[PDB]
Structures are given as structure tokens and as C-alpha cells.
């Protein structure tokens, strides 16, 4: 508040009186009379630079930056390395860009949904979520932010034909439209690589959504995929091509403990 400890009418009886030269409260047969007011230092009083409302709370990204943020999140939604390495409990899963029939848009009961997540061997992420439920450490507890849990598998669908109802109560699951993906939810925490479940309908729409590469997006105005800075990402192959190895000075690895002088 703008008035924080700043509603007092204290002069400061400065100098000649021992005291301290703060602004000290007037008259009174209370105790709050010659205390100090409007000092950061003092009771009542107020802080450094009242936390104001016109702090620049929100921020900013270029469309392109935050389109090819999604690319990088999606590209790593394959690659079981990265996805597993979020503790996404994908071991008995059949294949990783996990596509499912378009019957799924039409389940309308959580029991159906749950039976899908068994038969795709994807319980054990939700299972995992379901064990990670506890009380938040701190003060957030007494503010509408008591419990917490993991994230569960992302599920994606070109059209809510009843699906989002079905996969709702199941903890950890977030639905995302394909047409309206979100970096907050694909890549939570600013870490890469969440377990995702494309439904065929959606999975087709990915190239038309935001491009193949030698072809426009045809759904965004002008947008094409980012080019790479390099193609052969593994260098270990590179470093033992005969092209390279031929044209290299021979090593130096005697090592060479220094010589005590006698």
C-alpha cells in the first residue's frame, strides 16, 4: 500500500535531546509516541521502495524465437534419452513418438482413458506422479498451493470430441491442442523433453501446422523450420573418418614427469 507506515505525523525532534533524529511520533500518553516512523529501520514505518504495481511484471518474446522453442521441445519429445532423463518412466512403451488411433478423441469416461494408458504401457509415469504427491515445503502451503506432484504424459488431439473430459481426473495429464501448443506445458521448468501421445489426427497435422522444411507451414503465414548450424551432430564418426585421421599429426603422450636436477 502507498500509505504503509506513512500515516503518522511525526516531526523529528532533532538534536539537543539525546534521542536519534528519526521522525518521532507526536504527543500522546500511549507508548506509540516518540517511537520513530517513516524509517525503513523502524517499527510501523515502511520498507525500501515500496514494492510498486507498475513493476514490469510481464515479458516478451519474438514469435520466431517462441515457435522454434516449440520445435526444440517437440524434437526432443522423441529421443528416449532426453525423455527418460526427465524421469518419464518410458521403458515398457512400444515406440516413442507415440501415435494412437483417432478413436481416442471420442472416449468420454475416465475408465476408458485409464485402460488406454495401461495398454500403451504408460501407467507407470502416472503411477509415478501418483506417488509424488506431498505437501509443498514452504509458505505456499497457506496460500492455495499446498499440494504438488510430478507432470504426467502430455496428450494431444486435433479435436476435443469428448476426450478432454475423459483424461482429466487422471493426475499429471495435460491436454494440448496441436493447433495451440504451449512451451510452458511441453517443456515444463524450461527443461526439454516430455512424454507425448500424438493421436494420428494430430500427428499428421504437425507438418501442416508448422512446416516440413522444403515446404511452407501452410497454416502459419510465413514460417519455416529453423535450419541447423550443423548436420552430422555426432562428431565421433567425424573424428574417425579416414579423411580426417589421414591429415593429422601423430600424438604426443609420453607425458613427462619433471626431472629432479642433481
Amino acid at each position: 500500500s502507498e500509505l504503509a507506515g506513512h500515516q503518522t505525523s511525526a516531526e523529528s525532534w532533532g538534536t539537543g535531546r539525546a534521542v536519534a533524529r528519526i521522525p518521532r511520533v507526536r504527543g500522546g500518553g500511549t507508548h506509540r509516541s516518540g517511537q520513530g516512523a517513516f524509517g525503513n529501520m523502524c517499527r510501523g514505518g515502511r520498507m525500501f521502495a515500496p514494492t510498486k504495481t507498475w513493476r514490469r511484471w510481464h515479458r516478451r518474446v519474438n514469435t520466431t524465437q517462441k515457435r522454434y522453442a516449440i520445435c526444440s521441445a517437440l524434437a526432443a519429445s522423441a529421443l528416449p534419452a532426453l525423455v527418460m532423463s526427465k524421469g518419464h518412466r518410458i521403458e515398457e512403451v512400444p515406440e516413442l513418438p507415440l501415435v494412437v488411433e483417432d478413436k481416442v478423441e471420442s472416449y468420454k469416461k475416465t475408465k476408458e482413458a485409464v485402460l488406454l494408458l495401461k495398454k500403451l504401457k504408460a501407467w507407470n509415469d502416472i503411477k509415478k506422479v501418483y506417488a509424488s504427491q506431498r505437501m509443498r515445503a514452504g509458505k505456499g502451503k497457506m496460500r492455495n498451493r499446498r499440494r504438488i506432484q510430478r507432470r504426467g504424459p502430455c496428450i494431444i488431439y486435433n479435436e476435443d470430441n469428448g476426450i478432454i473430459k475423459a483424461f482429466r481426473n487422471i493426475p499429471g495429464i495435460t491436454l494440448l491442442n496441436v493447433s495451440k501448443l504451449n512451451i510452458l506445458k511441453l517443456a515444463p521448468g524450461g527443461h526439454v523433453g516430455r512424454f507425448c501421445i500424438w493421436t494420428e489426427s494430430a500427428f499428421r497435422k504437425l507438418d501442416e501446422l508448422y512446416g516440413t522444411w522444403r515446404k511452407a507451414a501452410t497454416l502459419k503465414s510465413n514460417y519455416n523450420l529453423p535450419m541447423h548450424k550443423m548436420l552430422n551432430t555426432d562428431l565421433s564418426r567425424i573424428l574417425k573418418s579416414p579423411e580426417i585421421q589421414r591429415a593429422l599429426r601423430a600424438p604426443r603422450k609420453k607425458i613427462h614427469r619433471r626431472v629432479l636436477k642433481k
Binding site: 502451503k141 497457506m142 496460500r143 492455495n144 499446498r146 482429466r168
Partner: peptide, 13 residues
């Protein structure tokens, strides 16, 4: 989850 705004969900309230 609850939904209907016009209901509370507030530790305190």
C-alpha cells in the same frame, strides 16, 4: 478440479 467461478477453493476463505 473445480471449475465454477462463483465457488471458492481458498485455504482460508
Amino acid at each position: 478440479m473445480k471449475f465454477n467461478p462463483f465457488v471458492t477453493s481458498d485455504r482460508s476463505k
